[model samples]
Target: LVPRGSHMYNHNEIEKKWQTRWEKTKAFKTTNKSKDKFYALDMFPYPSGSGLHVGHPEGYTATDIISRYKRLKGFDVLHPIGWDAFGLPAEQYALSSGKHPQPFTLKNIENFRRQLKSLGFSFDYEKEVNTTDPSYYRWTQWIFKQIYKKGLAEIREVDVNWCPGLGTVLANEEIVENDKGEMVSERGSFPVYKKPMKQWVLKITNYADRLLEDLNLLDWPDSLKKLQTNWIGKEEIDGKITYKLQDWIFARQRYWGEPFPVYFDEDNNVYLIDELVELPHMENIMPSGTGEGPLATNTEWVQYKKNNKIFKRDTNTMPQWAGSCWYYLAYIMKQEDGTYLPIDSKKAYEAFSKWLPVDLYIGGQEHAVLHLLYARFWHKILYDLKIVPTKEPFQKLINQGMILGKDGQKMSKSLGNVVNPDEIIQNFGADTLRVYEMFMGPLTDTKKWNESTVEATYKWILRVKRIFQIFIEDKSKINSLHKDDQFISEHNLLIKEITQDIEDLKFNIMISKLMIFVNSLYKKEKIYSLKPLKDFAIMFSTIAPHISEELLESLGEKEIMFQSWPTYENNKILLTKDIVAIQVNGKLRETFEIENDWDEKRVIEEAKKLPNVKKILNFII
Candidate 1:
């Protein structure tokens, strides 16, 4: 028996069946070398405790639509998915709950995978990577070693945002000022204090010029490129300045982080340990202070005997920025062997020659400062070292607008207004979520969530389903072709307008055009030819799929996604010229039929006798 609130149209069964079939076939596997390679990647997600949210699917679905379209267009598309798993929040949660971060992170990843799979995204699961996995991070560390070899990585005492209660250094983004005139670090809610620490610093500022200059070459959104340009902060000043600071202060009081590879002498001079020997005994390194961080006082790590000179190891861990800044480049040059990363100078140049300027880089604008700037700097360094083929990393960048809560504020835990994705999926289905988010506005505009809007979009899907159900049941109405020549002419015109609207991103008008087409079909009360109807259904399915797919199946087609988009001959839409409006002194006077262009004298002779022309001439000087 059907449940009381069950949908009149049963989409769950059909959706589940197709999803399972796609999974069994492994339809989305992508390879590097194809007739045509199109890469569509998402900024891999960080699995939060709360699970997926409504905002996640907006960009995911947009990319999915494009990917699916590209595949249909005969492009061997590379759409891969991964997780950005190594982050502070999970670690903090582990510290607080006494649970291992690995298990916690893995559980969230599983949850995310399930959610994404349910959304019908065409991503290669086998190619998926998690940043936290030792296999992946091994390469991350290997890349760091390469940078070190290039002298890009260095040990120096630098000004850092210090948190006292946390007993560690905090990234700039991690600092927040309170109403009580006190600053606290975002991670541990610890009080912040400023201090210089001998830290591993990547000279990103060195590549600032190239970072700014390369914007013109990228296909990214202008605002995003501008944000990255601003963050690089390239100012051509007159001279280079030098400063002599006190002896390096290298020590942090953090319990969780990489240990510094160094030792201190009685004279307090700092020295770098030999890479070959020192890293093997990382456990022996200790901090200098009694504080909880490594800097809190592990004197063994701080003091070392080298060449009869007493040298101290720097106590600071590499900041979060250290890993991410150069990671993107590593992907281009990853290597199976340590001797050459996948993207060496030759390969880098080749890739850059083809795709050096990223066509489009979409992410949150929050990375405008450190992340964006650092990445540019890293790209420039590679360019200078002749390691990379391009002077710039990303060609074009776009910052997606923030998704806000119903109350028009940013979604946060304190407000208790965050919309969970799992629940939304269960209620409205993934396609609805996809459509609703996109329909809210342009991809880069901030939008507020409204449950009512979601419902409205779902209702439109339902309407499409109802229309298709009628088409399926009423064979007479479905097969009844309108034989009138005028009807065919009007339908052709509608098709041309609809195609134009779709190409222009005039989506609302396109929806209206679909409604008009459907209304026209209903008015004829004739069985529409299944071919045009099926084509229209597939095109509509790109935006609103549930009903469109139902319609396609009803028409006996199996895979609608692979169906070719409707194409029309230009000659079919040509308009016949009829009455031409004649103007007298720029004012419309009379309409006349003309087969060809009239001479200027003939036009002037005809206009002289017109009442409007005579009046205008009488007033002329």
Candidate 2:
């Protein structure tokens, strides 16, 4: 008869207990200075109305496992989580609803944090930063001011890809294209003309060479590095053709952006605003646009005078690319006092030098052309200016493929096909969600979301739970004494296979092997000692902890994650006898069991007498 409370496992209780213990014990906190340092970072999330999806935990779990494993191996791991909270969605939502974006953004961030915490991820929350926080953006602005001081930040007239619907200038990378390389427009509209605007530009294209050259020195995944290289868009050829400015059209009529900081005098000569020292009191810098942009029609901003000379501030705010292009470098030499980084740059560099060049940069592949390339360009420029120590920003870059709906279309609200992660988590669990998403396919391959697959994962979790319950219930009936040598041999083989699978990142195969082990345990009639079973339990815990923890407690062991990983004695793990399967005259085959170094003649003689081989050879010419 089944025991009480045995029909269904209490997943919430088990997971929550382990998560609480992990936190109370501080199992995941990592320090910067240690015998060895490993830095693992995620592409911080941009808080949105919808909370985290199943996709977030897929990579988070991978990094968590590695971080925990590295800790056991005696390495200090630096794993951090943060918020990439500034973007157009929040602003747009705020503008339409008349609600401040700050509160909405913060609320979303809280929801995301709660979900991540529930998943048992090992990240240092104390060091968490939100990009929208003034403390953070102050540095962002300060870095801009510094870059402006360095002369890399400047105002100029350039051709910009403008999106009428978005009411702003889009970077070349932001414009999405179809499979045929045609620009996609909204509501079945035709492609719009590229317009010229006076805008603030970061000279990232200037550093393209170094960004492409330094990818070889880092230990990163090939696909990610390849993506970064492709994004840099390095062209070996150049053209010096020049166009006359008189023929160029300008003056977009807009009201919602930064105005140029110059004015024109009576003589038609252009002049710049006051020096950096007098920037605080300068009220003349205002939007010049007319209806929707700074360039619309603000005459006061367009007029300026310096020493009886006249100049006009180019009425344009920096493009979206201007901020993000150099943001990573800002994180490097945050508060230094120089136009470019100085000798003290080494100190800033050394702090993160060991982890220099992000080990893994994860994001959607849609940015393969624009954002990724811009970041690399900025990194190379910093390297040239001696502002940073590394020649590249990201050592490895991976573009995660899009998550599609059940109908095989991109997820969208209009289609009513989006899956809510919170609902899934409440019904199933975080582990099931994580395992299902990763099991979809290669990290970069696009996959369709299937509710049936999630249900299957949940069923597997139940199966794993049952395996432990049965093993524990039958523990008393088994004999402790058995053939130790044979048992040891079997255990060694299992360990060898499991270790190899882990090393190869063949997690699916590893899961299969584990299920096989569970079946083997169930089939045994005799009771075996718990030591080997305990070791296996520890190994399993790293992948599926809920079941392993329950089993470990029943076996009188501590939490499995805290225990030392299993190590095998080389001689014990190796197979003692070697067998060679041989075929004679392309007929039936027989195995030659011998010492490690048996020759072919000894095997043929032994094989000749085998019933299957002899029967086939008698008919052979």
Candidate 3:
């Protein structure tokens, strides 16, 4: 990696500088607004010590672009970001290293925050959350207790992925199938044996009909929607629909998660401690290793005295999925107070009513069966409880493609093929990395990553920078050139093509269309107006915000992100005419431009003018 002293574009300073500018400007901040709101949600990241891999940024970059685009389009957008911090990996690392998990988790979060900031995503930092933070997950616990109160959560014995090495119950989603078709823990590739144990479970299957029927309301790709259908794993027979869902396993035998709030009576009956008292605090927090977690071996916190009676606590902590299943709603929570509150204020609820369901949600499809399912189920529960304004968590969903290795294999450390985002940003700048990820292929496909592929965008972004330089912060001179006159129609068409494509998350093709637009403008050897260049950069702003901001600022446009989408003459698209073939008597034909709206008679007259057609009409053949 090149040092920051001399890179091709000084992108290090440029990216860092603009990040600071956005911070100062609060360029992407969202206030509690009752209307004109659009929420673009992303699957939050899990902060690990490795920082971010190239894969993490794939969907994030896309979401940032859409957020910026929606913001530009006059939406009071909430594109908040947060960390999905609770999981076994952090605890495992802590236990192995003889360090506490809390600090390690936070340190990793710090690195993750820096990495994402360096990339210059326009996330609302004011709304930033860490799932590990009690202020955030307290609500996670609150939701769990609500579901429990609703009869959705129950502790029942079921077959789970028992990993002796990891000493935890793995979700079906967490276990990967090896070449031999054996289910194993994805972390250490250890054998996963099924063992039944009493664990907290959620009754997502109860909402199966609603979840399936509501797929029609979402503007998702049919294939992806179908995958969700298949992944839910249900079947119908004898005209009766029976849900084949396993009650969601909601507890883990791990120390690092939201502790269960319910306490047990001496008769082993479970009862929730009232919210007014100190809800169960996590003490003896480290794993005590008695075939159970903290409460199993603890004497004080585990065994509580209340109402002149002694009671025991449930040792099982909530699963890692608990926090992420509802993080989207947590982001826009409203309260003048800084601490966590389960109920929203009037202002917050009004805002939630306006943006009840996220306008767009982007994430990896790996979560289609687990995270999305649970979130929607929980959203329904909240809707019943009158806490949520909508029954759906996301109105629209897009799954980004997986970033495989150069050899088209799944990226892994063992294969020595994991591409680091930091390394790429250090080498070719964050813009190159972001642009290439979008440009590599469509939003939903499993594809390989090639440096040569990235090399193309590395150079294209430089060309984009140079294109923004041609305009002199003016518009009249842009119309001075003959080719410049045709650009309005070009811009009209470009916007038409790209607007739809980006809306559908077909970014690879969108990049291609933008490239053509850039190439056409560059062929003139001079940019005529600020109008086209400004709009051009506006489109790029979402896709590659760093260069876009730099370019727009150079044009003397302040807060370019606030600029609205470019307008186009709807009739100008009709002015665009291309040649079509006119056939005679099903024989060889002539091609001619009809300026659009060419009818059969117009085409026949044009065909009659050709040499062979005239001879045939004269019966001279």
Candidate 4:
């Protein structure tokens, strides 16, 4: 029977307590100085005004599971979180509210941080970077200077996706076809038209070959690789080759972005700034309707004097992608020189080399083309500059599938069926929400949210807690000399299956196996070995941490986070008996049990002793 009140598990309090402890102790912070390192990364989220949906945490949870599992396997894991904070949405929100983006965006980020923390993801909060921070974007500006010096960056007047409503230029990828079959801005579905503007662009097309060639090196999904390849647009015909991939439009005619580190004189001669170019103070954060950005109106900020020559600063700011393009590298930079350049110096290189290429990167498929391709392009540039050691930014990539609303429709505000993670966490718990999401379906498959299933999962977790409570309650099992061979085999089987499932990214199947293991233990109504139960809790901890921690604590064990993953013995898994079928002329008669590893002759002898087999054999004779 399950335990009574005061002993019952309270997930809300326990989760908050553990989350606080983790924050205070810096439990998930990585040293990045270890020989064995795993870089499990999530596409750092943009802090939207709407907060988090049930869909957002799917990929995040997957990486967290791997992070915890890798740490348990004795690998120093680098799992950090930061904000992709400089983007259109926050700017739009501030504009609508008649305010500046900095304060508003920071507030949104705070909400995101609280939500992510409540879920208890093991992200290194200490190393957190916000793109809007002057200390951070200064590095973004620095990288641009390097690109400009290489002649890979150019000022060109080309056809660009100019949106009148938004008063800015959208990237080619940001223009999506609407229901009317007209190209519209992805942000607000505003009408977009082509306009020529002398904008700063990166010659990303030059690296198409390397980008396409190195797809073979990564452990990414083939479809995702092909998506990037097609976006790069390489084709051959009649012994001639052409490319569809265009130069990357790197500048935005907008406010709330990193200022370009370049200035131009009366002759339009360009000079890169050695000092950090920070975004200037602006009472109004709106772009000029004619084409230039708000900085164009800032007379003092726009005008720079050098060598008795008056130069005008390039009014355009770096695109939103600019900050995200190299942020993964920023996590490992030494930061001794007030810059987050990837490998600017020997000390920085020493730190960057350890986590140069992310071991595992997880995100949504929507980023397959633009985001991923741009990241690869930037990484290759850094590689050519000898700033990074690796050929690619991410080694293994996974695009987690979308989580649909309960109605099986894609979650949207208009649909009125969207599932909020906060609601779920409040009603049930963060552990419940996490386990439910992973158990919904395959990590890379579209799954509809079901309230019934979530409720059942919460009960199942409670069942696991109750069973663990019972196991720890009685003292007799601790002193029992005998270990159930069947229980041991099942325990080992659970370890082997769950281990493979996690490796293969088959989390849904892994939860099913965990449920089966728990069900088998519950059926016996008796604790065989405390060791098996303890190990089960450890294995379950990766998926559902808070309750498992509480359960382990009930057993007088602390430091579950630091415990090594349970390893199963191959010999211990050998079955004691095998179920054999009694058949006459291939027709089923009855069943027989024989000891495992019986010789063929002995097996045949035992089979013939069955009444049906004996009768059939005598008749044949």
Name the candidate that leads on lDDT.
4
Candidate 4 versus the native: TM-score?
A: 0.89
**Which residue pairs in model 3 clash with each other?**
478-528, 478-529
Whole-structure CA lDDT of model 1: 0.59
**Candidate 2 residue-wise lDDT at 15:** 74
Q: Model 1: per-residue lDDT, tens digit, 1-621?
A: 221154434546665665676678776765454456555656566664536677667667666666665665566665666666554544454445555556777887888898888777887776666555554555455445566667666667777667655546565545667889877875456787767665656554444555567667666666667666554445545775322212122233444333444445666544444442222223322333333444425576555566776566655544444446555554444333423234455665675454444433456666665566666666676676676666666654556677799889866544666898776666777667777776777667789998888787666666666666666677776554456555555566766676666444444466667667776665666654665677668777666565566678778886654566666553454464345556645666665433356454565465454444412211223
C-alpha lDDT values of all predictions: 0.59, 0.57, 0.75, 0.81
- Angstrom error at residue 87, model 1: 2.8
Which is superior by lDDT, 1 or 4?
A: 4
Candidate 4 on 239-288: residue-level lDDT in tens? 87778777877788888788988888878988888887889878877777
The number of clashing residue pairs in each candidate reads: 33, 30, 2, 0
The top-ranked prediction according to TM-score is 4
Q: After superposition, how far is residue 302 of candidate 3 from its true place, in Å?
A: 1.0
TM-score of each: 0.74, 0.73, 0.85, 0.89
Where in model 4 is the C-alpha error above 4 Å?
A: 1-8, 32-34, 237-240, 334-342, 412-417, 477-479, 575-621
What is the TM-score (0 to 1) of candidate 1? 0.74
What is the TM-score (0 to 1) of candidate 2? 0.73
Order of candidate numbers by lDDT, starting with the best: 4, 3, 1, 2
Off by over 4 Å in 3: 1-7, 31-34, 96-98, 186-188, 236-242, 276-290, 334-337, 344-348, 412-416, 470-484, 525-527, 571-621
